[PDB]
């Protein structure tokens, strides 16, 4: 039931750094410290994301793959940065250019060999291997390129293990890069044909959630990441704890992926109230449903209201009765029957853990698989095709070893993905 | 549209098989196109294009394909013949055949060269665990896939050799057949007419790729039949069908032969084989 | 005479823990006794580990606690084929060692959760081998039928249609409990919006206590397991009877403890107390086993049944003259020290087979058909050593269960 995290690229590393800051507190594990856990329930399944080596130094099982020293060199020189073993650091002093081809065909291809070695050392650790989780962004070289090539090999070495991926899709409103859509289109192609679970995170939706659902005036990267980190813990770690109704990657995927295509999900948080003021503690149960099932609160840019639902995964974590949970869940599917699919009687897959995230009393991780994600991929196709027509920065790709058909493959594939979702929307 | 021609072939009971039980004739025959299933119970109907009795050897069966194989060069498009059935039902017998009794494959090259400026290339590969292997030359794993700028997929790094002699063609494919003696076997030959180009593919059917491919095929034939009969295609889901897309989605004749045992114990197997091909 | 129990699946383990707790509680057996007579099987360590760490931890033996270090998977196929097959050996081994150790057994009490992984798959293959190795015994399974609208798993129906298809011709008596109807009962006949799984399971564990436990305890009208399979199923088909409890009153709000036979027996015929969403909308009774326990007078019983037999509102099937198996036990019911149960000095455990099951089945068959039409999560089953065959053959089978329950009744 163990897993190995992979933080490819600058973004992926930053995300991982914040993710490990959270998870550690959610298991009472200090950088060089051991199990300081306030409780004893955070020790029964630690193995899943840690490794027993010394006896006090529980090293997290993650991999840092990036071609920019500076980036990785800021992750290791910070707080929890000294928790990762040197062997886990897979850096490539080559050209960390923001080019997909440069990080997939030339500079990225060379470092692959140094990754495969580590991924095997981590897979053949102990117990049973569940899968590999990848964190990255579709707006960079090492992220969209290197991160997607690494997984392509993983899914060939271990076609049994599932592959959970957290991708920071290019935010619509404002792109953090110019080539962004190019790198995205190329990465999404391989992704949709490798991973078995993908959680789309959107920079513009993230900002929003930190500005309207959180009175935060200055939502920095750390903040944004912190929000996501809370979701991935409810996804992964959570399922590694006891509960009246527990689940796991397998149970989740076997109920979340209706079609081999892979299908993209959208992370949502339940208790999202501002600290001081907002602290009403109104989280009995329907308040969580109200939140999670609302447009605003969705980490993705697209809104659920713009597309039917295919799958719903409400992973609760806190002492509660299966009656107040199941009842509420059902009611929502009866009230909003309009967008909740017809060929599936009950899309919602209820899950209820026991131990909540340390300081919280009641929580619930939301995972939605709606066809609304069409209003995201469509954007990408548009952005891509619009600049592809003129072959904008094609010289940066072709010059680093690429093919004219590589773009057609990616575009076609991803464009077909948009279509597929629509085939079920109606 | 060109619906796959379904031909049903019933092989004679094996020495040990017949000795075990004289179940031969479990399937009843009504019309040349249809078969009725009556097993001592279950009653079903299998509708095909044509069927040959259990007494019919490979000789009588290959002749039907002969006319279809030689005509392909004239067609100017791709052609594919799929052999489906239970192991030992006669698939290999129908494809390559025995030394004494040649199958559909040997006769095809014999007739093609007989008519043979015409250029013909030969390719023989097997797919195992979604990986392609070149049966043609013994030294040797991944194979690669090439896609044209238009989006048309083609097999890359496949060993293609021109054949000057008729026996040479059969012998060259035999080399690969020797290797594989579980997986899918596919023999592809490109005919150049001077340019009118045809492609003859002899496919011997048989892991996650097998159960998937079988289902995807059933999904594609269903989706296709729907589109053809009345006012999404699963080809992308599976690489096997995707590479053959040009032939399927394009204008081309698709012949499918279903070989099975007339045995009553094999009835459960038989229904599945015939179900993959066609129903009523 | 004895009866081992096979609790499989996440839910099956939780329901087993609750039932087993109550069991020892009414037998004067604290955590440290003697040795029980059941086993727990699941594909998730944490599920079995909860009992290996929680209460009554040392009340069991590591030999009767089998777990599969791999993955559970919420799909029948995987739990049946892929993984399930691997574990069957070890599991069967235990159910054969305990069967020999005991002295003249009667059968095996199965406990599973229709719409699950190990609860669906595992059980299917387990009972398959059991009905062959121990065909000369009683095969009673206690299943937890997926709530009609309050589903858990998304694939839920798929897992229940495949488990019934393989168990229908292998089970003798399949008791079914509706999860949705349990929520309602705790809402109306207990009044509480905080009924956790451990509370729901306690209800079932009470009914089951009167099923197995009590039956093994002498009384004025002892009832064996054989008697059940004989009086409950008129046809080889593993017909699914319903579970009903009489004293389902709260030990805080309402206070009516002293509830004469006439009242407690009648409280079982109402759909608002049958632990099943199989309301008597048309389902005619064909066989009912009234299991009484506590201070009950045979004459009073033989009067409550009489008045009902002449009520007509409980319309029985035509071919059924008298379908009331009277079971009178001595041992009164047993309420948990700190639960929510009133505690009466008598209970009416009503179980029966009614055409009502045709409803529930219809709605579940519908689910299967609807989803199957678009294949949905079929690839998760297919890629686990499965195909359209077994699927379609399970659709056809269930169809003959819709016809069965329709032919066994509705007409004279
Ligand atoms: C006094 C008190 O009760 O403080 C709360 C608090 O005020 C609130 C506002 C917290 C607070 O969270 C944020 O302000 C926040 C900041 C950046 C991004 C996202 C959120 C809190 O910081 C977060 C913190 O969360 C946890 O402790 C969880 O275990 C959480 N942990 C982390 O995210 C984490 C933070 C720093 C270091 C390590 C871990 C978690 C959630 C899911 C899965 C695993 C862990 C909590 C309850 C609080 C504070 C401390 C103020 C809230 O968030 C969470 C994730 O619980 C924001 O809305 C909720 C409601 C809480 O009541
Ligand atoms: N009464 C009762 N029902 C339960 C309990 N636990 C789960 N269920 C129900 O049983 C079904 C859940 O099955 P799961 O827990 O998902 O799975 P499982 O059968 O244990 O096996 P896996 O799928 O392999 O994990 C749902 O319909 C739940 O409502 C319980 O403790 N009591
Ligand atoms: N949430 C989030 N996004 C980030 C972070 N860093 C970069 N990004 C996003 O990632 C994209 C840029 O890709 P980048 O990570 O620099 O690529 P790479 O470093 O070359 O692999 C932009 O869309 C950014 O908004 C981060 O720490 N958190
Ligand atoms: N129609 C037939 N007439 C005579 N022999 C046959 C016929 N079909 C099959 N056989 C023989 O029966 C055996 C099984 O045939 P084969 O084609 O190898 O089975 P499969 O390829 O389906 O596993 C072979 O020895 C083959 O020569
Ligand atoms: Mg053969
Ligand atoms: Mg379980």
Residue numbers in the entry:
A (entry chain B): 2 to 44, 47 to 360, 369 to 437
B (entry chain C): 61 to 100, 115 to 190, 297 to 320, 326 to 366, 378 to 390, 398 to 409, 426 to 450, 455 to 503
C (entry chain A): 2 to 34, 61 to 439
Anything the authors wrote about it?
The properties of MKLP2-MD are such that an MT-bound MKLP2-MD-ADP structure could be captured, in which density corresponding to ADP is coordinated primarily via the P-loop with some connectivity to Switch II/loop11. A portion of loop11 is visible near the P-loop and the N-terminus of helix-α6, while most is not visible. However, in MT-bound MKLP2-MD-ADP, loop9 as well as the N-terminus of helix-α4 are more flexible compared to these other kinesin-ADP conformations, reflecting distinct properties of MKLP2-MD. With ADP bound, as for other kinesins, the C-terminal helix-α6 lies close to the motor-MT interface and terminates adjacent to the C-terminus of helix-α4 (arrow). The density for helix-α6 is less well-defined, with a length of three helical turns at most and is thus shorter than typically seen in other kinesins. In this configuration, extension of helix-α6, docking of the neck-linker and formation of the cover-neck bundle (CNB) are all prevented. Strong density corresponding to only a few residues of each of the N- and C-termini is observed, although additional density alongside β-sheet1 is visible suggesting partial occupancy of neck-linker conformers directed towards the MT minus end (dotted line). Our ability to determine an ADP-bound structure highlights the tighter association of this motor with MTs throughout its ATPase cycle and is consistent with the biochemical data. Given these properties, it is thus not clear what state our ADP-bound reconstruction corresponds to in terms of intermediates in the MKLP2 ATPase cycle. It could for example be the MKLP2-MD-ADP complex as it binds the MT from solution, or could represent a MT-bound NN structure captured after ADP binding.
